[PDB]
């Protein structure tokens, strides 16, 4: 039998989901299993779990985000300037490799759209509109993105049958270690300005390692070292949801247990 909405509520809330929670979900749905529904049951479950007064936040980015065409050049190359669509939050669809499930939830009746078009987040709920706004170039996961709006409201990470390597929240962790030799990256974003299109060069901290350790593509980073470690370290509320082992994280506990790891491993 394929999962209904009421069963995944049920497990959702023997989980430790709870009404009025802030919730960010990183979700395999090939562990999930099959849906009544497909997909949009499991967001109508969340949704239901969280109730009318909880929020939902997903990182969704954006599936034609232009970061490696444009990644360590001062301009946008020439190609790339002149035809790359302009990021237009309503219309722009997530990325598919955070996790087919962003696309029903980008584009659930209510949802808002922060502004960042390679780190954008999508959220659902009485404060959406609060999470998602600032999202500047140059503060992708850090200070005064919405990833750290969630950890100052008690944000609960939701891992529905995803990898340690999935924890998007640790990134904010990287941003504000105080260690020494942080990689940073440069790139170029087309977003829309007034109707018009218009190319913003930024730099950042990479989120694809912090530190050259990190940064192997085959190749643990430092998100899943860290989370690994926690995981190991840390009594977590885990059971089913649908056919997937999910774990039901506090957002704060692991960013700090984060930043401690890393600031007691580089000098
Ligand atoms: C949509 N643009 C994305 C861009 O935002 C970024 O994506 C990274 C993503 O590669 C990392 O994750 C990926 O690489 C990790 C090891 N490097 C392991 C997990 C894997 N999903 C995330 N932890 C942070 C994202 N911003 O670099 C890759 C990309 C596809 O260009
Ligand atoms: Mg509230």
């Known amino acids: 039998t394929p999962w209904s909405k009421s069963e995944l509520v049920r497990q959702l809330r023997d989980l430790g989901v709870r009404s009025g929670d802030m919730v960010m979900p990183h979700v395999s749905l090939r562990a999930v299993g099959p849906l009544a529904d497909g997909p949009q049951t499991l967001v109508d479950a969340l949704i239901e779990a969280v109730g009318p007064t909880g929020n939902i936040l ?5 599936r034609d985000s232009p970061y490696e065409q444009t990644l360590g050049h001062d301009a946008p190359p020439a190609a790339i300037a002149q035809s790359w669509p302009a990021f237009d939050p309503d219309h722009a669809p997530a990325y598919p490799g955070f996790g087919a499930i962003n696309e029903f939830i980008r584009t659930y009746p209510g949802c808002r759209r922060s502004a960042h078009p390679d780190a954008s987040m999508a959220a ?35 891992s529905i049958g995803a990898g340690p390597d999935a924890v998007t929240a640790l990134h904010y962790a990287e941003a504000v270690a105080r260690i020494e030799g942080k990689r940073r990256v440069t790139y170029s974003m087309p977003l829309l300005r007034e109707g018009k299109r218009v190319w913003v060069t930024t730099s950042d901290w990479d989120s694809n390692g912090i530190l050259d350790e990190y940064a192997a593509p085959d190749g643990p980073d430092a998100v899943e070292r860290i989370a690994r470690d926690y995981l190991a370290r840390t009594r977590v509320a885990q059971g089913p949801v649908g056919g997937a082992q999910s774990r039901l994280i506090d957002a704060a506990d692991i960013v700090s247990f984060g930043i401690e790891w890393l600031e007691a491993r580089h000098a």
Do not use: C, Q, T
């Open 58 to 62: 997903a990182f969704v980015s954006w």
């Open 124 to 158: 659902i709920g009485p404060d959406a509109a609060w999470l998602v706004a600032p999202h500047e170039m140059g503060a992708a996961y850090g200070p005064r993105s919405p990833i750290a709006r969630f950890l100052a409201h008690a944000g609960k990470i939701l």
